[PDB]
Amino acid sequence: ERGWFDILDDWLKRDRFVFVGWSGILLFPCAYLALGGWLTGTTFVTSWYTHGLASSYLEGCNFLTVAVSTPANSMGHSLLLLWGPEAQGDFTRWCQLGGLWTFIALHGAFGLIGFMLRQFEIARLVGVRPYNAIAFSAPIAVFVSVFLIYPLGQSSWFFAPSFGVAAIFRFLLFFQGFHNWTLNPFHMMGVAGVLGGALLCAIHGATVENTLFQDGEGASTFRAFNPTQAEETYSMVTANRFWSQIFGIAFSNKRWLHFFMLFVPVTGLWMSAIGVVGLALNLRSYDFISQEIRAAEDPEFETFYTKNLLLNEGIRAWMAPQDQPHENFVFPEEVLPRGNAL
Amino acid sequence: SYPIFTVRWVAVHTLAVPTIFFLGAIAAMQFIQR
Amino acid sequence: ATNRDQESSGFAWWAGNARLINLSGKLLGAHVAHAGLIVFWAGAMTLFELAHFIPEKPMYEQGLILIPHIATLGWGVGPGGEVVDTFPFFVVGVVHLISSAVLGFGGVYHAIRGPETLEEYSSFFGYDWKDKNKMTTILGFHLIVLGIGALLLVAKAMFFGGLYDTWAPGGGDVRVITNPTLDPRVIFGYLLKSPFGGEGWIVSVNNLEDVVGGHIWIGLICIAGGIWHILTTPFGWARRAFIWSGEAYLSYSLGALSMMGFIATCFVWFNNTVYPSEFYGPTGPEASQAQAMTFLIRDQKLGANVGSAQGPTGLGKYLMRSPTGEIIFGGETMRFWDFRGPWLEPLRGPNGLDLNKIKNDIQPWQERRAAEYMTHAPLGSLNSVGGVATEINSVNFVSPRSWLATSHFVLAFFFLVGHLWHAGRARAAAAGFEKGIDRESEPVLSMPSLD
Amino acid sequence: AELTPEVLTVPLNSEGKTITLTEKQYLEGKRLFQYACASCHVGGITKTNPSLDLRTETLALATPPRDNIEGLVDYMKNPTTYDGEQEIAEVHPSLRSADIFPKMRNLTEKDLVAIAGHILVEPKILGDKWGGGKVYY
Amino acid sequence: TTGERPFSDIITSVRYWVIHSITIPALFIAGWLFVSTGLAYDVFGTPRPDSYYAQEQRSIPLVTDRFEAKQQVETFLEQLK
Amino acid sequence: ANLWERFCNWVTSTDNRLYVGWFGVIMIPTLLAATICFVIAFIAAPPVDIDGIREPVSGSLLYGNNIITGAVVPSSNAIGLHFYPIWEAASLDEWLYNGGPYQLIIFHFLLGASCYMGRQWELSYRLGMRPWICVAYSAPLASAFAVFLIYPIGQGSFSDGMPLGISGTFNFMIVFQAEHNILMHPFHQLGVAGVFGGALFCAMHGSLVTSSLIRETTETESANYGYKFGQEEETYNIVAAHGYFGRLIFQYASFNNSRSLHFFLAAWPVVGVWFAALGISTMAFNLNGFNFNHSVIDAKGNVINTWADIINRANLGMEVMHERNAHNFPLDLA
Ligand code: CLA
Ligand code: CLA
Ligand code: CLA
Ligand code: CLA
Ligand code: CLA
Ligand code: HEC
Ligand SMILES: CC1=C(/C=C/C(C)=C/C=C/C(C)=C/C=C/C=C(C)/C=C/C=C(C)/C=C/C2=C(C)CCCC2(C)C)C(C)(C)CCC1
Ligand SMILES: CC1=C(/C=C/C(C)=C/C=C/C(C)=C/C=C/C=C(C)/C=C/C=C(C)/C=C/C2=C(C)CCCC2(C)C)C(C)(C)CCC1
Ligand SMILES: CC1=C(/C=C/C(C)=C/C=C/C(C)=C/C=C/C=C(C)/C=C/C=C(C)/C=C/C2=C(C)CCCC2(C)C)C(C)(C)CCC1
Ligand SMILES: [Cl-]
């Protein structure tokens, strides 16, 4: 049977400069539109009607301050389809109401699905194990938990991260002030995975490069390697002795080493995603009850935990009126928390 | 010897064509006054 | 194309300047051409600064780092650091710019036209990195040149107009240094001071007599050691401790420059004698003390007894004691009580800040100076918005002290990395394994196992 | 919203005469204010004495009144304390003290009017932000 | 190799540069005019420097209803005189 | 074989289970001193007057802390940058009140860790290795110098050094953002690219090599038994890995030279973390992140807020609340 399905399969899987595949039918439009929506919005589109903010090069923002901002809080969790009942097919209104945000987020979500299907599809054609696709589940878990689950637990898309450099920084600081997110052990595990992964990257790359065999005569050692050679290009035995004597322990199994390099950052990102799922519901690690009982009763008891809450209280009161304009917070000067003199 | 219009050709131009248009638009923005 | 590709030289293009290691004549060219770049920037940057300079604005409001260096030496300024004549700034710039053409010419000639190696052409200018006698002789010549350079500063100070003295009675002025400090207990006593707070090692030099006398001692020492290294050859203990190779010599200099960069970072951050605040702006400690002074003055004018005003913590609102008893400014500036500056010392008594002087002897010029320094604190954004990080746009300011300290910390750090890179490589190349482990001779395979 | 002649019309003196500035004067006032005054007065506050700001309501109750061009131009020649009782040229920049405040040496009478006009117009634009401090940033 | 013509072949060919010495500036100028004619403002609904606020108002025209948001923006746009 | 040569051959011996070496002769006592003091102080030290205002902060477990809130508290702001060894105090009780332990721990630790870096160079020399592993370690080492030594120097007090504790670290980060807007500084942004990218390339390299392991085992056993320590032949097929990853992106975006691949793995996080350390080290001298507060202005001159102005609101809340009793004058200039 060589019907139209099989002929199409043939064409999709040709060895070309950019492999396409069946997964490419999903991947390429959705990735292209998500990127094009971000460039279109950061270049031309305002956030005046949803946030009270300028957010495009057209308005005078720079690369750090442009964003595609989230819709207004009054939209709730509306899909904000261009043909939906809010924009009613009007492209200009759609832009002013924040339709580009759901546009980028939804096409991005399906684009990420398509990239992971591409990893599976190419792996199956070339004949390798699909561990690259498995590792890519961690970026997907982060994207889905931060950009979809988190706002879906909150009141509206408005509280999702906006797509911009400084807008994401605001997201970090909101999470400190409102959620005490540094205190959350799921974030802590994520930090461990990311910093541990950067550590392993640096140390493995440096170790290989400084245990190389002399396999050529030049002072540039890069040339003395052939992709099809059978021999290891560096000495695992010497590397093992160096680290055992420097650090006490060392890798001895090169397959374990590289699985571990996969395991550490992937697991960290997965842990951080779980904590953000909790924050969707305000299920925070905000307090230690035992500390609060002591501190309420004993005005001489002070720790770095109590010092940080005072900082969080400053963040909430001083940023909330501007950051949440739909709430209409009016905080007179006299109610603002402030230390002496400042 | 080689073709001119390939998949690679399309992929190159769906990126490069809007890029140049956007760069001209952003260059014009540097002369806008309030 | 002698040694101008990877196959002949062994070095790829991205390490292309390593192809010059044994080509003394081209290596001379690279060094001379580069010195021309240094002199070019000094000349051109001065002219740029001068073209952009308004004499009625303080230097530190105008982004100037070179003119302050010239003014400190006594050229173009008078009482209080006011600019009286911009012509010396012009001269210094022009002469450096003109000289860079001479150096660029010589550098380009030796680099591409002259003899690639100098050993065949001249045995005086030729050298082998491994010739310990020749290398210390070249070192000796350059120590004599450096020693002459330190004496040129002494000559300026003692015979050719003097130096700007921020501490001079009457507000600061150019002063001729007639009695430079020569007592070696003073000069070398600076070298044994702790580098910690209240001591500050050599960064604490606070008078021009010590600065000039230290350069007399440094001048002689360099000239003597230069003669010593011309007439001698390294001793046996020295021979066994060092690696003797071009890359090794480079690595030692990289370590030395890194150390000097870190010292310069602290000098411009704390010292207000050889970096006068009139020209560079107040130091961080200085501006913080100046705020305390400003509000003490304001509140005392409104009738407050600043000596007995208890602040919210129980410590004095305006005045308190240091851990050793001295009367100092209160608030968070308690950390800065080691600061000394000409606008503040008239209020100082044997026990520190004197309450009677505070009550009666504060002059309007001190109030002016403290308000100016408080409002030119060395804080500011990377796009030169002056003030704390939360300040709005309006003031286009970043202190010269911040520019000079941040740039030289970054440079000193990378030069420490360069020392480690090149010292480790020099050791490995001398011993013969900088290209990798010999498979048939892997040292670990001949060692007993650890367990 | 636009910078209109209405916005640029400010009191010339205490008797109720107004003067209408040009956009060029206003913009020149801003640049000269930044040059000579903003190191202490950014945003209409006073960093070395926060009790006194540059709000029009505060300037109206100065002695003599400073909420008009002539009062402000006189202040830049011969500044006084808030109650007019003392002359503070020795510690505040002015033409009288241009020898010790050198940035004042190249200010002309026309410059003083432009700076004055900036101080009087900015609150009409910024509202509470002018003289309000960090609370309104 | 995958059969397409090498990029280094193409971009050093006179024919490439004959074509793209026109198409590249033409696109740039089209982008410039999209802004200089003011068309970008109207396509995307972005305020000009003089249309963020009415002359004396200092409140944001913030959308506060879901299904009448389109009419709210149109109402805000009228009130610009 | 005299006694000094015997000692030198033991110090530098490649047969010790842990290499000592000349750097190790300084490393071992300083690290032991810092470790013992830290453990004792973390468990039992009494509260410390960090900001010099007679307002002691409790950092130890016995005084009401858990693992997350506990810290060794930086030394008093009244001390500034003065050297405060035990023998400069009238008593141990004074020394403890004023944060003496902090100074003892970080000075011994920074010495020991610098010698740890030298020790990495030294052993590579004794084994016939290339020497630059220590250059990779200089990135985390420079970062420790930045938050424990350089930042105190520029701000004039070890009381603004980073606390030795988990919540103390967060306090340090929040106040740093308030006073330098570090999120808006490109060196911190390069640092984030360094560690985000380092974690990405970590999982990337590990997944690709794991994906191309050569079948050497049955399904009931760990594939890790298919590699044998010291074997001569490579354990995965780099050509198949390149063939997969070249098609995932495009062919020329993929490495086929294992040496340059591994050099890139070394360089990206190390260079990134160097920039992070330089960010902290240069914000130590108050060259702060980009300030775009009120940068966008409308035709009338109304401020149009950007996301930068929202960040500024958060920074103000941190600024006005931190060290709430420590300021008497309106500007926090250090
Ligand atoms: C200060 C920076 C500096 C200096 C002084 C040098 C100097 C040198 N390099 Mg190095 N190099 C540098 C940076 C520098 N390099 C950088 C950044 C890289 C990385 C790209 C390299 C990579 C590199 C490689 C791969 C090689 C060198 C080589 C050389 C030597 C011979 C160059 C030659 O033959 O070119 C010939 C070039 C020309 C004839 C073109 C014009 C060159 C002239 C000098 C330009 C001067 C213009 C100037 C404005 C004129 C002023 C004249 C006026 C004063 C009268 C020379 C000593 C070569 C070498 O080692 O040989 C043994 C070599 O193979 N370099
Ligand atoms: C006096 C200082 C000095 C001197 C004479 C040398 C000399 C040498 N170095 Mg060393 N090095 C130094 C300092 C120095 N280095 C420092 C401070 C570092 C730490 C970063 C290094 C790190 C280093 C490494 C890692 C290596 C060398 C190597 C070498 C050899 C080849 C150099 C070359 O051809 O580069 C060619 C120059 C380039 C390819 C250009 C580099 C471009 C830089 C990164 C741009 C920097 C940005 C700029 C400052 C600002 C932006 C500009 C932009 C906006 C336009 C040569 C002997 C190589 C070697 O070991 O050979 C034996 C080598 O692998 N050096
Ligand atoms: C010692 C070095 C030094 C210092 C402290 C200063 C300081 C200053 N300069 Mg000067 N200048 C310098 C060197 C220096 N400059 C050099 C080399 C040039 C020629 C390019 C100039 C030409 C110059 C001009 C034309 C002007 C200044 C101006 C100024 C002032 C404002 C600077 C500013 O806004 O920066 C902006 C900040 C940056 C651009 C950040 C640069 C970030 C770099 C690229 C990172 C590099 C890191 C490292 C080196 C690379 C490592 C790579 C790694 C892989 C190893 C300030 C006083 C201005 C002024 O006010 O004049 C009166 C002005 O108009 N300078
Ligand atoms: C330190 C830098 C330096 C060094 C070590 C050399 C060394 C050499 N040069 Mg080169 N050269 C240099 C810089 C340098 N030059 C400069 C700056 C220029 C442009 C002026 C040249 C242009 C040049 C040419 C055209 C030629 C040489 C030649 C030579 C070789 C023979 C020189 C001789 O015997 O003169 C004998 C010594 C003297 C005549 C004494 C001169 C005293 C000077 C001019 C007065 C100033 C002295 C004082 C220390 C200067 C302070 C400078 C400081 C402020 C920066 C010798 C290898 C020759 C060569 O390569 O033959 C094949 C050759 O033909 N050089
Ligand atoms: C750039 C300047 C320079 C350089 C590169 C050299 C280089 C050299 N000198 Mg020369 N020397 C110089 C200037 C210089 N000298 C000057 C100006 C004088 C006159 C004072 C001398 C007088 C001199 C004598 C009498 C001797 C040398 C010798 C040597 C050789 C051995 C160096 C050595 O082991 O140091 C290593 C340093 C030490 C062993 C010092 C002790 C180690 C202490 C504990 C380190 C302390 C470091 C600490 C951080 C210090 C911080 C600052 C401190 C002052 C507080 C070496 C070739 C030796 C030689 O072989 O002569 C032929 C020798 O006997 N030199
Ligand atoms: C710091 C060194 C200052 C500079 C520079 C400028 N001003 Fe100032 N101003 C300063 C102080 C400490 C005070 C209070 C003086 C007092 O004791 O009363 C003032 C006051 C004014 C006022 C009066 C404000 C009011 O009465 O409400 C005005 C109108 C004023 N200053 C204007 C002004 C101008 C125009 C400046 C640039 C030429 C300028 N100031 C600079 C501190 C400082
Ligand atoms: C949204 C939407 C859509 C779409 C659209 C699109 C698809 C677009 C695209 C667009 C695009 C596609 C654009 C682009 C642009 C680009 C740009 C704008 C770029 C720039 C660049 C630059 C600027 C660069 C820079 C740099 C760097 C980065 C680094 C290196 C160096 C340099 C400096 C060069 C549709 C219609 C469907 C529908 C509706 C909605
Ligand atoms: C070798 C080499 C190199 C390098 C080179 C160099 C580094 C060079 C240098 C050069 C130089 C370093 C040059 C210089 C020159 C200069 C000049 C030419 C000048 C002139 C001047 C003038 C003409 C002036 C004028 C004036 C006056 C007099 C007055 C005022 C005004 C004015 C300014 C107008 C490279 C890397 C490329 C590579 C290859 C090899
Ligand atoms: C000018 C002046 C002055 C003076 C100064 C002086 C007098 C100085 C001196 C200086 C000096 C006099 C210095 C010295 C230095 C030294 C060093 C820096 C050393 C080093 C060493 C080393 C590095 C070694 C090493 C080693 C070892 C340890 C082991 C064996 C091997 C080897 C060799 C490697 C004063 C301050 C008064 C004032 C101001 C001005
Ligand atoms: Cl204070």
Numbering used by the authors:
A (entry chain D): 11 to 352
B (entry chain F): 12 to 45
C (entry chain C): 23 to 473
D (entry chain V): 1 to 137
E (entry chain E): 4 to 84
F (entry chain A): 11 to 344
Paper text:
Photosystem II (PSII) produces dioxygen by extracting electrons and protons from water, which takes place at the oxygen-evolving complex (OEC), an oxo-bridged Mn4CaO5 cluster with a shape that resembles a distorted chair. Here we use pump-probe serial femtosecond crystallography to reveal the structural dynamics of PSII from nanoseconds to milliseconds after illumination with one flash (1F) or two flashes (2F).
The trajectories of the YZ area at Δt1 = 1 µs and Δt1 = 30 µs correspond to the re-reduction and re-protonation of YZ• to YZ, which completes by Δt1 = 200 µs, consistent with the 55–85-µs half-life of YZ•+ re-reduction by the OEC in the S1–S2 transition. At the completion of Mn4 oxidation by Δt1 = 200 µs, a negative difference density emerges on O5, suggesting its instability, which is subsequently stabilized at Δt1 = 5 ms. Disorder of W16 initiates at Δt1 = 20 ns, increases progressively, and reaches a maximum at Δt1 = 200 μs. As the reduction of YZ• is completed and the OEC is oxidized to OEC+ at Δt1 = 200 μs, the difference densities near Cl-1 increase again.
